[model samples]
Structure formats: structure tokens, C-alpha cells
Target chain A: SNLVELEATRVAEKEALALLREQAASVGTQVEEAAERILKSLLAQKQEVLGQLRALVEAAEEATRERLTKIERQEQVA
Target chain B: SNLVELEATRVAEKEALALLREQAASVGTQVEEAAERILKSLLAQKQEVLGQLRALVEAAEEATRERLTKIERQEQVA
Candidate 1:
């Protein structure tokens, strides 16, 4: 009778662990996907910051050159 | 006899799952830590990019103003 009870509980425990293992693997995959998403997002944001900086630098350079040209024209007139 | 065999296998399976559960928890922690590290590094890089752009803008603004001032002085002299 004791052996029968032990056998029953053992079978139940086995099924429980199998379910837990499956759930663990599923959770692990979700974590991996989330990490990948965060990495891609951060990289995309980095690119955006770089692009904005480049545009600002280019515009400033163009405006500076125009000012220099006006100064040169004024000197020639003087 | 068959009951004994079943009991033995169930015991082993239970132990295996226990170990796996611990391993899964450990891996999850590692993944979370890695994700945080990557995020911090990316944010630091972002800050550096922003600082560089701000410096460039300020320098350009100062240079442009200086040039304009010199041109104004020249006009007055002429």
C-alpha cells in the first residue's frame, strides 16, 4: 500500500516537472527575443543621433562659408 | 517489479528537472545583466555624440559672429 502511494506521487511529480521544463524553455525564448529588440532599438537611436549631428555640422559649414564670402566682397569694395 | 522500475526512473527525472530549473534561472539572470550592460554602453555613446555636436555648433556660432564683427568694423573704417 505504501509502495502504491509512492508510485502515484512519483508519476505526478514527473508530469509536473515536464510541464515546468516546457514553460522554462518558452520563457527563455521570450527573454532572448526581448533582448534582441532592445539591442536593435538602441542601435537605431544611435544612428539617428549621428545623422542629426552630421546635418547640423554641414549646415553650419555652409553658412560660415557664405559669411566669409560676404566679408571678402566688402573688403574688395573698401 | 514494474512499479519499482517506474519509481526509480521518476526519481531520476525529478532530480534532472530540479537541476534544469536552477540552470534556467541562472541563464535568465545572465541575459538580463547582458541586456542592461548593452543599454548603458549605448546610452554613454549617445551622450558622447550629443556633446560633440553641441561643441561643434557653439564653435561655428562663435566663428560666424566674429567674422560678422570684423566685417562691420571694416565697413566703418571704409
Candidate 2:
């Protein structure tokens, strides 16, 4: 359900990316078996907050990585 | 636009997913495929993940088996 690679764009990178992006847009975002499992789990957990909670989880993970980097730096200094 | 398949409960689940959620369901879901392009790259990525998972599981299983055999030999010697 996704095109991971763009056709060789000897003409232009933007055009290539646009083509790939449109390809992705047409097919809709790629969904693997794992993604299907996840969507199913989300439906089970709570159908209402599935998308919102997904955004929250993604934000939390990014925050965790940022905090971990800071802690690692502090440890190196100490 | 989200239901890929319609089982007996497909309509029920769709209705349930809508009913259970109180918030304004952001409408971003769409379904349209103009044409099918080769998904060779995405498939490769999926297979790569599967390969890694398989390797990880195999390594863990091998290690566990080896440790158990070593422990058994030690017990036999004692």
C-alpha cells in the first residue's frame, strides 16, 4: 500500500518527490501487517481516541528521546 | 472510507467506532486508488523488518537452549 522508492528522477528531485508523494497519496499511506494489527488493537482499546492517543504516544516518545539525550549529556559531564 | 472488508459485524463495528467516540471525529479518512504502482520497495522494507524479527527470536531461542544444555551438563557432572 506504499511506494518506498521513487522512480529515478534524472530531471529533478522535487519532481521525483512530488511524483512519489502523489503515488503515496493515491495509494494512501502504507499499512503493513503490523499496522493492521495496531489499528485492530486501537479499535479494541478505544475507537474514539485511537488517532488522538496515537498522536500523544508519538509526542511522548519524542519527548522521552529528548529527555534521555539530556540525561546522557549530564551523565557524561558528571 | 476505512472499512477494507465488510463482515456481519463490519457495519456494527463501524457504527460502534462512531458511537463510542464523543469527540468531533476529524474527517481525514479517504479511499481512492487511481492506479497500482509496483510496491517493490515497501515490500522490501516489510521483509527486512520480518527478517530482523526472525533473527532476533532465533538468537534468543539459541541462547536459551545453549544455556539450558550447559546447565544440564553441569548438573550431570555434579
Candidate 3:
């Protein structure tokens, strides 16, 4: 009877460990997905700001060029 | 005898679930920390780039203003 009890306990422990391992793996996958989502959002925001900055710079450059050219033409005429 | 075996299995599964819960919590915390780190890094990069953009815009404005002023003065003299 004692021997049977010991054998039963061993089987119980094995099953427990298997269940724990599966749960741990599931939790790990969830964590990875969350991390990926956060990084993606941050990257998208950064890209958007960069795009705005680029547009601002280009617009400033074009405006300055046009004004400078007008001044140069006036100088030549005078 | 079977009752004893079932009790043993139940206890083992409980312990296994507890262990897995602890591990899952730990992984979740680590994942949160990683997410925070990435966001901080990205925010820092964004701030640095924005600083540079502000400087470039200001410099362009000042340069354009000074050139226009010089051209106007030359016109007045002529």
C-alpha cells in the first residue's frame, strides 16, 4: 500500500510540472506580443514627427529661395 | 487507496499552478520594463531630432531676414 502511494505521488508531480510548463510558455508568448506592440506604436509616432519636420524644412527652403531670387532680380534691374 | 491518489494529484496540480503563476508574473514585469525602456529611448531620440529641427528653422529664418534687409538697404542706396 505504501509503495502504491509513492508511485501515485510521482505521477501527480509529473503531471503538475507539465501543466506548469505549458502555462509558463503561454505567458511568455503574451509578454512578447505586448512588447512588440509597444515598440511598434513608438516607432510609428517617431516616423510621423520626422515626416512633419521634413516638410517644414522643405517649405522653408523653397520660400527663402524665392524671396532671395526676387531680391537678386531687383538688384540687377537697378 | 484511490482516494489517496486523487488527493495527491490535486495537491500536486495546485503547487504546479502556483509556481507557474509566479513565473508568469515575473515574465510580465520584465516585459513591462522592456516596453518602458524602448519607449524612453524612442522619446529621447524624438526630442533630440526636434531640437535639431528647431535650430535649423530658426537659423533659416534669421538668415533670410538678414539677407532681405541687406538687399533692401542696397536698393535704397541705389
Candidate 4:
């Protein structure tokens, strides 16, 4: 392989991977933030807190983001 | 521009862009499916039908994915 071309390829891959990582992080945050408003809509009522259900929603959202984070990490590894 | 290098760059960019598009679509689906399980856990109860809230959750999930789709489109445009 041409050494100069090899270096160019290295940089290109680095920049693309960087962009992918940033996009992944942004998507994770968007999912969490977006769901927050929907969950809080429970505020529309005190009992609508659905109360403990609020915790239920948060637990789910947390798992969602964690799973997303896992995928992002795996991508970097590959 | 070196004609040969220009053609090579064009192909490289196209492949990277194609990968990005596919990644975007996958992320959108992951968000939806992940949320679905969280939302359905409500099946745990018939009255927990918190049922109308079910539609409420779906509305929010749809909006979230739509916003994401918009970003993906804008990215390809740029």
C-alpha cells in the first residue's frame, strides 16, 4: 500500500469515527430528553404521578440509554 | 485536482455517506422498539391501563423519531 495514501486513509477513518461517536452520544441524549416530557406529562395530575409509575418510566428510559451506550462502544471496538 | 484521486475520493465519500444513512435509520428503529417494551410493561395490569397514557407515550415516541428523521435528512442535504 502507498504510505501517503495509507496515512490519508487513517485520518479519514479517524474523522468519520469521531463524527459517529458524537452522533451516537447526541442520539442517546435526545432519546432520554424526549421521553422526559412524555413521562412528566404525568404531572398533568398528582396521582397521575401515576406516582411510582414515574419511577417505572425512569427505570425503562435508563435501560434504553444504557443499551444505546453499549452499541456505541461496540462500534468503536469493531 | 488529480483526476484519479478525485474519483477515488468520490467513491470513498459515497460509501461513508451510505453507511451513515443506514446507521441513522437503525438508530431510529432502535429508539422506537426500545421504548415499546417500556411502554408495554403496562400489560402488567389491566387497569394500569394507564391505557390512555399508552397512546400518550406513543405520541411522544413518534414525535421523537420524526425529529430524528428530520436531522438525518438535513445531514444528507448538507
Candidate 1 C-alpha lDDT tens digits along A1-78: 559857875785566556556555654555565567678766755665556556555655665686587679879997
Candidate 3 per-residue C-alpha lDDT over B22-57 given as tens digits, one digit per residue, 9 for 90 to 100:
655654555566567677755665565556556555
Clashing pairs in 3: none
In model 2, state the lDDT of residue B29: 27
Deviation (Å) of A73 in candidate 1: 99
Q: Tens digit of lDDT per residue, candidate 4, span A1-78?
A: 379867876786566556556555655555565456446433343342344455545555665676578679769975
Instruction: Give the DockQ (C-alpha) for candidate 1.
Output: 0.01
The residue ranges of model 3 lying beyond 4 angstroms of the native Cα positions read: B1-78
Lowest lDDT block of 10, candidate 2 chain B:
B29-38
The residue pairs found clashing in candidate 4 are: none
| Candidate 4 chain B lDDT trough over 10 residues, lowest sum | B41-50
Model 4: lDDT of residue B35: 56
* Model 3 CA lDDT for position B10: 78
lDDT measured at residue B49 in model 1 versus the true structure, 0 to 100: 51
| Chain A only TM-scores, each candidate in turn | 0.75, 0.37, 0.76, 0.51
Chain B TM-score of predicted candidate 2 relative to the true chain B: 0.47
Clashes of each: 0, 0, 0, 0
Error of 2 at B38 (Å): 7.5
Name the weakest run of 10 consecutive residues (lDDT summed) in model 1 chain B.
B22-31
Q: What TM-score, over all chains together, does every model reach? A: 0.43, 0.27, 0.44, 0.29
lDDT of 1 at A30: 50
